[PDB]
Amino acid sequence: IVEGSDAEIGMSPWQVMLFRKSPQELLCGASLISDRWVLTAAHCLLYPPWDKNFTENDLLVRIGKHSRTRYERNIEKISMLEKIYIHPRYNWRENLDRDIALMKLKKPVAFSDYIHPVCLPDRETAASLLQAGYKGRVTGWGNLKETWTANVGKGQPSVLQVVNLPIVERPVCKDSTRIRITDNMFCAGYKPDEGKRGDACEGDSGGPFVMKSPFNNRWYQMGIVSWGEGCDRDGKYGFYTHVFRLKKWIQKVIDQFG
């Protein structure tokens, strides 16, 4: 996250870290949507241009974390995966259209003060809240600078970072890139003229873009960090998978698989 701030303890209890067993490295963010289902971006698992194709046996999810590198004994829970489900029409060849994947955990995690699921939007929440100028919140352990991420403590944070960003109008999103954008994507960020800055960046993929409903006080996950050209560049915006537009596939998988 570029130009964010350290998250508060318990601020995003649905935030999940996707972690590779060997070498032990952080792959992506993800989010907890029930005691056994994690949502992430499909390119975190499958992206043939970079020879990426992970099976469930390669991965661990770590839930309840705050520090990026520490094993948080007695706070975080680590789970293995039972199955991974990539959207059948994920388009990795051209524009990462339908960038979404579900991961089923081998056993339910117990909730606690640091571990709690986020809600998934219904048609009416998506309708009221996914409007240009309305702000959402992005979280992750990714790079703090476009040029500087590597590890150690260069542009890589000690704890979870958070940034709040406005949704941008679809025209402005389309005219900032040469990539073909679809109805399954939205973009967010500040315009050059707005003075504030902020963006997700490398290592934040798969993480949640969430909004808090003013009607019932609950947090809803509206997007998944998907792609961008650089991080926090003037006139460029981060793109996010539109979770409500792919909600029928989500429901289908959970109803058919547990």
Partner: peptide
């Protein structure tokens, strides 16, 4: 393009039984 790429490995070792 897609958002790890420069992933080092400065992580504390997790408990043995998860590997």
């Amino acid at each position: 393009x897609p958002x790890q790429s420069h992933n080092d490995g400065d992580f504390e070792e997790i408990p043995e039984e998860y590997l």
